[PDB]
Coordinates of C-alpha atoms in Angstrom, one line a residue:
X20 CA -2.4 22.8 42.6
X21 CA 1.0 22.8 41.0
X22 CA 2.4 24.2 37.7
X23 CA 2.8 21.5 35.1
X24 CA 5.5 23.4 33.1
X25 CA 3.4 22.9 30.0
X26 CA 3.4 25.7 27.4
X27 CA 0.6 26.1 24.8
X28 CA 1.2 28.0 21.5
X29 CA -1.8 29.1 19.5
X30 CA -2.3 31.4 16.5
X31 CA -5.2 33.9 16.3
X32 CA -7.4 33.8 13.2
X33 CA -6.8 36.3 10.4
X34 CA -10.2 38.0 10.2
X35 CA -9.8 39.0 6.5
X36 CA -9.1 35.5 5.3
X37 CA -11.6 33.4 7.3
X38 CA -13.6 31.3 4.9
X39 CA -17.3 32.0 4.7
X40 CA -18.1 28.2 4.8
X41 CA -16.4 25.1 6.1
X42 CA -15.2 22.1 4.1
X43 CA -18.7 20.5 4.1
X44 CA -20.4 23.7 3.1
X45 CA -21.9 24.8 6.5
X46 CA -21.9 28.5 7.2
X47 CA -19.0 29.9 9.2
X48 CA -19.4 33.2 11.2
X49 CA -16.1 35.0 11.3
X50 CA -17.3 37.4 14.0
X51 CA -18.3 34.5 16.1
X52 CA -15.1 32.7 15.3
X53 CA -12.7 35.4 16.5
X54 CA -15.0 35.7 19.5
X55 CA -14.7 32.0 20.3
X56 CA -10.9 31.9 19.9
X57 CA -10.3 34.9 22.2
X58 CA -12.5 33.1 24.8
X59 CA -10.7 29.9 24.1
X60 CA -7.3 31.5 24.6
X61 CA -8.5 32.9 27.9
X62 CA -9.9 29.5 28.9
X63 CA -6.5 27.9 28.4
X64 CA -5.1 30.6 30.6
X65 CA -7.0 29.9 33.9
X66 CA -7.2 26.0 33.9
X67 CA -5.1 23.1 35.1
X68 CA -4.1 21.8 31.7
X69 CA -1.4 24.3 30.7
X70 CA 0.9 26.8 32.5
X71 CA 1.5 29.5 30.0
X72 CA -0.3 30.4 26.8
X73 CA 1.7 31.9 23.9
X74 CA -0.1 33.8 21.1
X75 CA 1.5 33.7 17.7
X76 CA 1.1 36.3 14.9
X77 CA -1.6 35.9 12.3
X78 CA -1.0 34.3 8.9
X79 CA -3.4 34.6 6.0
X80 CA -4.5 30.9 5.9
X81 CA -6.9 29.1 8.2
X82 CA -4.6 26.1 8.0
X83 CA -2.0 28.0 10.1
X84 CA -4.4 27.7 13.0
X85 CA -3.7 23.9 13.1
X86 CA -0.5 24.5 15.1
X87 CA -0.6 21.0 16.6
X88 CA 0.3 19.5 13.1
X89 CA 3.9 20.7 13.4
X90 CA 5.1 18.3 16.1
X91 CA 4.2 16.0 19.0
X92 CA 5.9 15.9 22.4
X93 CA 6.7 12.4 23.7
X94 CA 8.3 12.6 27.1
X95 CA 11.0 15.3 26.9
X96 CA 11.3 14.8 23.1
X97 CA 9.9 17.4 20.7
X98 CA 9.3 15.2 17.6
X99 CA 9.0 17.0 14.3
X100 CA 6.5 15.6 11.8
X101 CA 7.4 14.7 8.2
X102 CA 6.5 17.3 5.7
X103 CA 5.4 14.9 3.0
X104 CA 1.8 16.2 3.0
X105 CA 2.4 19.8 4.1
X106 CA 5.5 21.1 2.3
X107 CA 3.6 24.4 1.8
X108 CA 3.5 24.9 5.5
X109 CA 7.3 24.9 6.0
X110 CA 7.6 28.7 6.4
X111 CA 4.7 28.6 8.9
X112 CA 6.3 25.9 11.1
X113 CA 9.5 28.1 10.9
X114 CA 7.8 31.2 12.3
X115 CA 6.2 29.0 15.0
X116 CA 9.7 27.9 16.0
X117 CA 10.8 31.4 16.6
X118 CA 7.9 31.8 19.1
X119 CA 9.0 28.5 20.7
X120 CA 12.7 29.6 21.0
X121 CA 11.7 33.1 22.2
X122 CA 9.7 31.6 25.1
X123 CA 12.8 29.7 26.3
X124 CA 11.9 26.5 24.5
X125 CA 14.0 24.1 22.5
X126 CA 16.5 25.5 20.0
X127 CA 15.7 22.8 17.5
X128 CA 13.3 19.8 17.2
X129 CA 14.1 16.2 17.0
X130 CA 14.3 15.3 13.3
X131 CA 14.1 11.5 13.5
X132 CA 10.8 11.2 11.6
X133 CA 12.0 13.7 9.0
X134 CA 15.2 11.7 8.5
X135 CA 13.3 8.4 8.1
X136 CA 12.6 7.4 4.5
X137 CA 8.9 6.9 3.6
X138 CA 7.8 7.8 7.1
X139 CA 4.3 9.4 7.1
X140 CA 3.0 10.5 10.5
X141 CA 0.4 13.0 11.8
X142 CA 0.8 14.5 15.3
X143 CA -2.9 13.9 16.0
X144 CA -2.4 10.2 15.5
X145 CA -0.1 10.1 18.5
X146 CA -1.9 10.0 21.9
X147 CA 0.0 10.1 25.2
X148 CA -1.0 7.4 27.8
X149 CA 0.0 6.6 31.4
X150 CA 3.2 4.8 30.5
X151 CA 3.2 4.9 26.7
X152 CA 1.5 6.1 23.6
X153 CA -1.3 4.9 21.3
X154 CA -0.6 5.5 17.6
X155 CA -3.2 5.3 15.0
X156 CA -2.3 3.4 11.8
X157 CA -4.3 4.5 8.8
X158 CA -4.7 7.2 6.2
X159 CA -2.2 9.7 7.7
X160 CA 0.3 7.6 9.8
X161 CA 1.9 4.7 8.0
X162 CA 3.7 1.6 9.3
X163 CA 7.2 3.0 8.9
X164 CA 6.2 5.7 11.4
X165 CA 4.9 3.0 13.8
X166 CA 8.2 1.0 13.3
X167 CA 10.3 4.2 13.9
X168 CA 8.3 5.4 16.9
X169 CA 8.7 1.9 18.5
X170 CA 12.4 1.8 18.1
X171 CA 12.6 5.5 19.3
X172 CA 10.5 5.0 22.5
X173 CA 9.3 1.4 23.1
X174 CA 10.8 -0.2 26.2
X175 CA 9.8 -3.8 26.9
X176 CA 11.4 -4.0 30.4
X180 CA 8.1 0.3 30.6
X181 CA 6.9 2.4 27.7
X182 CA 4.4 0.9 25.3
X183 CA 3.7 1.9 21.7
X184 CA 0.2 0.6 20.9
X185 CA -0.7 0.4 17.2
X186 CA -4.4 1.0 16.7
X187 CA -5.5 0.1 13.2
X188 CA -7.9 2.7 11.8
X189 CA -10.5 2.7 9.0
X190 CA -10.0 4.8 5.9
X191 CA -12.2 7.7 7.0
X192 CA -10.9 7.9 10.6
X193 CA -10.0 11.4 11.8
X194 CA -6.7 11.8 13.6
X195 CA -6.7 9.4 16.6
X196 CA -6.5 12.2 19.2
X197 CA -9.7 13.9 18.0
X198 CA -11.9 11.1 19.2
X199 CA -9.6 9.1 21.6
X200 CA -7.9 10.5 24.6
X201 CA -6.8 10.3 28.3
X202 CA -7.7 12.2 31.4
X203 CA -7.0 12.0 35.1
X204 CA -5.3 8.8 36.4
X205 CA -7.1 6.1 34.5
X206 CA -9.9 7.6 32.4
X207 CA -10.2 6.8 28.7
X208 CA -12.2 9.3 26.6
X209 CA -13.6 8.0 23.4
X210 CA -16.3 8.9 20.8
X211 CA -19.3 6.6 20.5
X212 CA -18.7 6.1 16.7
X213 CA -17.1 3.3 14.7
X214 CA -13.6 4.8 15.1
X215 CA -13.6 5.3 18.9
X216 CA -15.3 2.0 19.6
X217 CA -12.8 0.1 17.4
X218 CA -9.9 1.9 19.1
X219 CA -11.3 1.0 22.5
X220 CA -11.8 -2.6 21.6
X221 CA -8.2 -2.8 20.3
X222 CA -6.6 -1.0 23.2
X223 CA -8.3 -3.0 25.9
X224 CA -7.0 -6.2 24.4
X225 CA -3.4 -5.0 24.1
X226 CA -3.6 -3.7 27.7
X227 CA -5.9 -6.1 29.7
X228 CA -4.1 -5.8 33.0
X229 CA -4.8 -2.3 34.3
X230 CA -8.6 -1.8 34.2
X231 CA -9.6 1.4 32.4
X232 CA -12.6 3.7 33.1
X233 CA -13.9 4.3 29.6
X234 CA -16.1 7.4 29.2
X235 CA -18.2 7.4 26.0
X236 CA -18.6 10.9 24.6
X237 CA -21.1 11.8 21.9
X238 CA -19.6 11.6 18.3
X239 CA -18.5 15.1 17.4
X240 CA -17.8 16.2 20.9
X241 CA -14.5 18.0 20.6
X242 CA -12.5 17.7 23.8
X243 CA -9.0 18.7 25.1
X244 CA -7.1 16.8 27.7
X245 CA -3.4 15.6 27.6
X246 CA -2.2 13.1 30.1
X247 CA 1.1 13.7 31.8
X249 CA 0.0 15.4 37.2
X250 CA -3.3 13.6 36.3
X251 CA -5.2 16.8 36.6
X252 CA -9.0 16.3 36.1
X253 CA -9.6 19.4 33.9
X254 CA -11.1 18.5 30.5
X255 CA -12.1 21.1 28.0
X256 CA -15.5 20.0 26.4
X257 CA -17.2 21.7 23.4
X258 CA -20.2 23.7 24.7
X259 CA -23.4 22.1 23.6
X260 CA -22.6 18.4 24.3
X261 CA -24.7 18.2 27.5
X262 CA -24.6 14.4 27.9
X263 CA -20.9 14.2 27.2
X264 CA -20.3 16.7 29.9
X265 CA -22.4 14.5 32.2
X266 CA -20.4 11.5 31.3
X267 CA -17.1 13.2 32.1
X268 CA -18.2 14.6 35.5
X269 CA -19.7 11.1 36.2
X270 CA -16.1 9.8 36.2
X271 CA -14.7 12.3 38.7
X272 CA -13.4 14.8 36.2
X273 CA -13.9 18.5 35.7
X274 CA -15.6 19.3 32.4
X275 CA -14.9 22.8 31.3
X276 CA -17.3 24.1 28.5
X277 CA -15.8 25.8 25.5
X278 CA -17.7 27.5 22.7
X279 CA -16.2 25.9 19.6
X280 CA -19.0 25.9 17.0
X281 CA -17.2 27.9 14.3
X282 CA -13.8 26.1 14.5
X283 CA -15.8 22.9 14.6
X284 CA -17.4 23.8 11.3
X285 CA -14.0 24.7 9.9
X286 CA -12.8 21.2 10.6
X287 CA -10.4 22.2 13.4
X288 CA -10.6 20.4 16.7
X289 CA -9.5 22.0 19.9
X290 CA -6.6 19.6 19.9
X291 CA -5.5 20.7 16.5
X292 CA -5.6 24.4 17.6
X293 CA -3.1 24.0 20.5
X294 CA 0.6 23.1 20.4
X295 CA 1.4 21.7 23.8
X296 CA 5.1 21.7 24.7
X297 CA 6.1 19.5 27.7
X298 CA 9.0 21.7 29.0

């Protein structure tokens, strides 16, 4: 066991402003929610995924829990997202950057995507792979972003940038499509994961991939980068947990019902910074 130098920033929920119901109308239990987040923070603390967990101060909007939206880390680059859809979150991202700097992190973030005209990109649509990234193309991440990410990182000699075309109702790619261990592909069993898997296996047909089919809705957390086998799995998805352990991985159950109902994946609630 060795320390991966990965730092995870999260923001605790503001109890007073937790909505009573999620975007679809299902009931949300704020007492359960703050319970689950404290347990989630403690789970991140003792596992192989991250090294150090940093808690950030409360803000009066449940959107501020989506700390992953601010940036994505590709290699040693901390790539800022364009603010075209989230101008109202500038002051939040700001405050988050003070926590990053205070922990010994970067002084600034790379502004390539912010300096590129008409570039739309969502951090969840970028998924880190063995020697490259898979980027979803669809309702959040447009083709300029794919063009820009390729010139930023693609190396044909190798670092691949796979474009995976998404349907209009696809969630961010990383919510249902991920990597674990050395060569394990994690994907949801719905139209979105199955399409992404069909596309990715054609673009990379040379290294055979162990595809693990999770149940649709099974929130999971695993970022490739030591090939640790720890994968956070939403508590309640029994068969998914079986599928993950059937592939030599370590499924770690996390109670996530209330953040699930809020529309916030575990991935969205953790800002992982590859120091």
